[PDB]
Amino acid sequence: EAYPPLCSSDAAMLRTAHAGETGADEVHLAQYLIRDASPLRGCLPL
Amino acid sequence: EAYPPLCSSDAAMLRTAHAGETGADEVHLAQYLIRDASPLRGCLPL
Amino acid sequence: EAYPPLCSSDAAMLRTAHAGETGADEVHLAQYLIRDASPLRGCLPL
């Protein structure tokens, strides 16, 4: 058994363009990204 | 260990006229700033 | 008697689970879109 993990090249593609607290982002125009299937997701919040 | 606060590279991007916070994420492109990871975020009523 | 299907050429707006707000549009912009009349929608954990 295996699951697709989360692959990222920079924090920009996951933190979008805003000004405030922490958040989440997905693929906008070029940087494809999918939700992480690993159970270790809530640990160490951003 | 030390607690690094948030730096203000520019005096015009820290207006925070929209009740301090507007969005729910960070910058995307040109902004020289360091995220304040210290839990002591309360330093005088701004 | 049958039921209308649910498919679209642009699957990038449905494959990703936003887990929140979504586009409340009754018709697509240019791609084909048929409303699903199935009693159960969004089966299996996306």
| Long-range contacts of the stretch C31-36 (C-beta < 8 A, 24+) | C32/C7, C32/C8, C33/C8, C34/C4, C34/C5, C34/C6, C34/C7, C35/C4, C35/C6, C36/C3, C36/C4, C36/C5, C36/C6
Q: What is the DSSP letter of C14?
A: H
- The resolution in angstroms reads 8.3
Q: Shortest CB distance from B23 goes to which of A11, A12, A18?
A: A18
Mark out chain A residues that contact chain C at CB-CB < 8 A: 26-27, 34-35
Instruction: Record the tokens describing residue B12, joined without a space.
Output: 């015009």
Residue C15 sits at φ, ψ, to 5 deg, of -70, -40
Q: Shortest CB distance from A23 goes to which of B22, B24, B28?
A: B24
The three-state secondary structure class of B23 is strand
Q: How many CA atoms lie within 13 A of C44 on its CB side?
A: 2
Contacts of C10 (CB under 8 A, 6+ apart): C28, C31
Q: Which chains neighbour A (Cβ–Cβ under 8 Å, 3 or more pairs)?
A: B, C
- Contact list, B23 vs chain A (CB under 8 Å): 18-20, 23
- Contact list, A15 vs chain B (CB under 8 Å): 25-26, 28
Q: Shortest CB distance from A20 goes to which of B23, B28, B29?
A: B23
* Structure obtained using: cryo-EM
d(CA C18, CA B7): 33
d(CA B31, CA B9): 8
Nearest CA in chain B to A25: B25
- Largest Cα separation within chain B, whole Å, is 34
